[PDB]
């Protein structure tokens, strides 16, 4: 694991592979790091240069950082990719990392970012149960309750050892400060855009987006309708038990990313 100072903050990352073409850039969700992509990584790096990126405050340095959100996540990873002289690249973002993935796509254009894959991101407007949990993890006294309740629904009774180990053992060293911030940023993201589908339609020059998921349940039909209206959009339900398709089904998700890049 290596680090750079980007925008005055410490960004940890991983740089593997030398195949030519667009670079895979992995972006995790809130309160976990590039180990979310340990399963996919052998397949990704065999295919393309692969850069796994941590968010600010998520690297080995677990000091509390200044408050930040989606605009900073985007500017940090862009500044990192500029420093690494990465040209065109394809973000792979887990759940609400997709908000930053889309902000990055929107900032650089379709030629510098020709595709984006998103993993298990709520595509409807935010359910009220969700918003309720986004406020419970902002609760100093009961943020742990909120997390366990989010986690338990993310697992959905799974037996997949990789997903179990990642949630139980591989996301330590975070607390109220980061979980409350995730509550703040995810809540404000739905409040501002309505939904990530609305977020996508606001892209001036939409690149190729693919949403890969196992958890929403409502509707694939909302996806069919979105794909039928926008040729740049695709999607695939994976059939996994969990909220973590990249960890539960790493080869299949990698195959999807390699497919998405091939098309674009």
Rg over alpha carbons for the chain, rounded to the nearest Å, is 17
Pairing of strands 2-6, 9-16: antiparallel
Category of 12 on φ-ψ map: left (φ > 0), alpha (ψ -120 to 50) or beta: beta
**Residue 236 CA, distance from chain mean position:** 16
Packed helices 176-193 and 97-108: angle between N→C axes, nearest 10 degrees: 60
**Is 58 in the active site?**
no
Domain(s) labelled CATH 3.40.50.1820 in the chain stretch across: 1-124+195-264
Catalytic annotation, pick one of 58, 166, 223, 243: 243
Residue in the block written with tokens 């690494």? 84
Residues in the chain: 264
Residues that constitute the known binding site: 96
Question: What is the C-alpha separation between 260 and 139, in angstroms, rounded?
Answer: 40
Experimentally, the structure was elucidated by X-ray
Question: What is the C-alpha separation between 201 and 148, in angstroms, rounded?
Answer: 34
Domain(s) labelled CATH 1.10.210.20 in the chain stretch across: 125-194
Start-to-end CA distance of the chain, whole Å, equals 30
Q: What is the DSSP letter of 171?
A: S
Residues that constitute the known binding site for substrate: 96
Question: What is the C-alpha separation between 166 and 259, in angstroms, rounded?
Answer: 26
**Residue 153 CA, distance from chain mean position:** 18
Beta bridge partners of 53: 13, 27
Could you give the residue ranges of the DSSP H alpha helices within 194-219? 196-201
Question: What is the C-alpha separation between 188 and 249, in angstroms, rounded?
Answer: 30
* Burial of 237: CB neighbours in 10 Å, binned 0-12, 13-18, 19+: middle
Q: Which CATH class is domain 1-124+195-264?
A: alpha beta
Category of 254 on φ-ψ map: left (φ > 0), alpha (ψ -120 to 50) or beta: alpha
User: Within 10 A of 234 (CB to CB), how many other CB atoms are there?
Assistant: 20
φ, ψ of residue 173 to 5 degrees: the values are 75, 15
- Out of 1.10.110.30, 1.10.210.20, 1.10.340.30, 2.40.170.20, select the CATH number for domain 125-194: 1.10.210.20
């Amino acid at each position: 694991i290596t680090t750079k100072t980007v925008n005055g903050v410490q960004i940890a990352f991983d740089d593997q592979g030398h195949e030519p073409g667009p670079v895979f850039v992995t972006l995790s969700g809130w309160a976990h790091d590039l180990r979310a992509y340990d399963g996919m990584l052998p397949y990704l790096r065999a295919a393309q240069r692969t850069v796994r990126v941590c968010w600010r405050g998520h690297g080995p340095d677990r000091n509390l950082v200044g408050d930040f959100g989606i605009d900073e996540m985007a500017a940090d990873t862009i500044g990192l990719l500029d420093a690494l002289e990465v040209d065109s690249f394809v973000p792979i973002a887990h759940a609400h990392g997709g908000w930053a993935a889309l902000e990055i796509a929107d900032r650089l254009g379709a030629q510098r970012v020709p595709a984006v894959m998103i993993l298990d991101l709520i595509m409807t407007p935010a359910p009220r149960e969700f918003v309720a949990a986004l406020h419970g993890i902002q609760d100093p006294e009961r943020w742990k309750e909120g997390r366990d309740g989010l986690v338990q629904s993310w697992l959905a009774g799974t037996t997949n050892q990789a997903v179990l180990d990642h949630v139980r053992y591989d996301s330590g060293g975070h607390g109220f400060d980061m979980w409350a911030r995730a509550g703040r940023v995810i809540d404000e993201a739905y409040r501002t855009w309505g939904s990530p589908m609305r977020r996508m339609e606001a892209l001036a020059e939409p690149c190729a987006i693919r949403h890969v998921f196992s958890h929403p349940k409502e509707y694939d039909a909302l996806h069919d309708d979105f794909a039928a209206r926008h040729p740049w959009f695709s999607y695939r339900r994976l059939g996994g038990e969990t909220h973590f398709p990249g960890i539960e089904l790493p080869q299949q998700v990698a195959a999807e990313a390699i497919d998405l890049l091939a098309g674009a």
